[PDB]
Amino acid sequence: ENVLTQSPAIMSTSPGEKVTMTCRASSSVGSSYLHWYQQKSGASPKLWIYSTSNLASGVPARFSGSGSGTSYSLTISSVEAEDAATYYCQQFSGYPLTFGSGTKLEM
Amino acid sequence: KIDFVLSVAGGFVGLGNVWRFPYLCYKNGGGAFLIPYFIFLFGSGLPVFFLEIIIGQYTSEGGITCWEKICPLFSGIGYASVVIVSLLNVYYIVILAWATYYLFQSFQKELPWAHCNHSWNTPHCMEDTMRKNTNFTSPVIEFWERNVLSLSPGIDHPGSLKWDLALCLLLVWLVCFFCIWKGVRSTGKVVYFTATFPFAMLLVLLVRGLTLPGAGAGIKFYLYPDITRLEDPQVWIDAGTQIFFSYAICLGAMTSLGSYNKYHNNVYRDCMLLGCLNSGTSFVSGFAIFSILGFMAQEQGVDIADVAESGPGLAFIAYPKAVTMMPLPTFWSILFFIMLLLLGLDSQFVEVEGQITSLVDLYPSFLRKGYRREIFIAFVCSISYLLGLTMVTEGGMYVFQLFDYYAASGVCLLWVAFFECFVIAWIYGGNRFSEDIRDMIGFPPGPWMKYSWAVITPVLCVGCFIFSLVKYVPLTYNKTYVYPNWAIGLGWSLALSSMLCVPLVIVIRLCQTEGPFLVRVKYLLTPRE
């Protein structure tokens, strides 16, 4: 199984600033076969970014994503209070499906 | 990406776009041909093409095996496709033989078709410029009719066998046999030149076409329609057949299994790009052909529809005129004919390789046992040569026209496509086919492809077939030559050689299943693991 790992497991942040978090995979995955999900504290996860560029319907343009090969990341223009949640990177290139360790904003 | 184009588009882009499409458009009155052309395109061409790609990738094999895992009852589709390719390879290389003959005749200080002071030329000839200074004849057309072709007055008079055309065919088939047996393919760095030279030549020819005086009438005839003309089932059949032929419909599955087997690629977008490119080059070459036709009409003082032959020789009549109206005509003629040979040779190689692979898949125990691989290729190339030798005689043009209309064209392609789409959509199941495509490439076809397979393609096929058999008109060569009843019967036999492949295999497999008849149908309809 292609194990995906996210380095900044904990991200202390200041409101209104820009935050970028990255995901790494043990093997190269297609650009169209990786997606990001947002999980609120105590709530079910929801799709956030798919195909590494396409933002979901429920997320504004404030969020963005980029990456290729074995390295991938997302960017936030300005983090608000509502942006505090846990984000996971997942691959869809081949089974078994794997999810990243997750990155949770600590502020 | 350009990699997919250079890898795939070479086998599809060929003589069908630059030669078959212009003469079919000219035969049907120009603009009236385009509306059914685009209707058939956007209704079935891209969807059925993507369906062939999926079928090839599903089993990683040609039509000889993939149908056993879908619907064993309708396994005759693979045999029908194989015999279609067998009939196509016999007559497709006659165009290359004519191109080689023209190239050999181009090695002169002056082009033979530029003037009519020569011995083969009739007294009725008159120079095009001086024709508009009676029943005069242009040197370009009568050269094609008498020197290259030596046209017999009818198919009932085969006449003598032309030795020069036979040797040109021999050279082209020797090249084909060498390339197939040596595994030669456009995998080297020369593939860039091989792909890019034909488009550059087409662009130069188009630029020449637009700058000729009177080309505006040619473009008007090309683009202005005539509704009443669409009422002729002939134009609908021509448009649908051209759509299926240019895209290798009912032929793609034997080669896409290997060529389109690359993983992690977007099959949907690749098929869309190929469909855009093929239609674009065909529609672009249409302008080049019709501009020269309009210039000829303006120079000779005759109507556009009467300037040239309404048959396979439209390209060999128009393009030599264009290269004759260029500085240093010999150089441009030579370049054009090498371009035509290069476009035809790659498609011929792909078709012959697919035929050989399918046939050795019908007999792997014997043909693949050793050195028989080269002997089978040699036998195939010899049998195809002996079959095509009928078309180089003085009356060979009529046989070539009959083969073009019936052997790999007409109701046979509609029959095979309709049966394929009907099976996949209803008997195998559209819901199962969508799931298979989801598992293969990651996303379902969507509604356009599903509805086109379910309804749009079968409705178009049966509608064209019914409109043909209710408003039937005999096939004719040029605008006046009527074919005899035995020639029509021969053409219908050529069409039926592929048409009957489905019912005969159906009945053979039905008689090969034990138990009651209903048990036999239940056993044969269920797909295999």
Added chain:
Amino acid sequence: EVQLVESGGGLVKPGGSLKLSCAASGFTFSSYAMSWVRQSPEKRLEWVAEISSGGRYIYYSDTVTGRFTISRDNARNILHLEMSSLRSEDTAMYYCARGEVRQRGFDYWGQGTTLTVS
């Protein structure tokens, strides 16, 4: 595409068997692929299994391939997940997700149900 609801969570002994349910409404369940996503008590997400729209193609994770089994009911639009032997590490919260398009991911997620082994 509105509602997804899980049910069947409970407390069982290790090594037992339990069957989960995931009801769907507002969309064609027979034409959408369904997958199960498992959230461990350490909040780590883990994939379990995926079932196709027609149920012919089925995949499992390496940790649950030999013990779990997934099924669907297109007539009732109910997704089932049955497990034969729950190990000590099988305790988690289970989510059913819609995964029809691989290039788009899990569009919708259910409320989820907790499963406890002790």
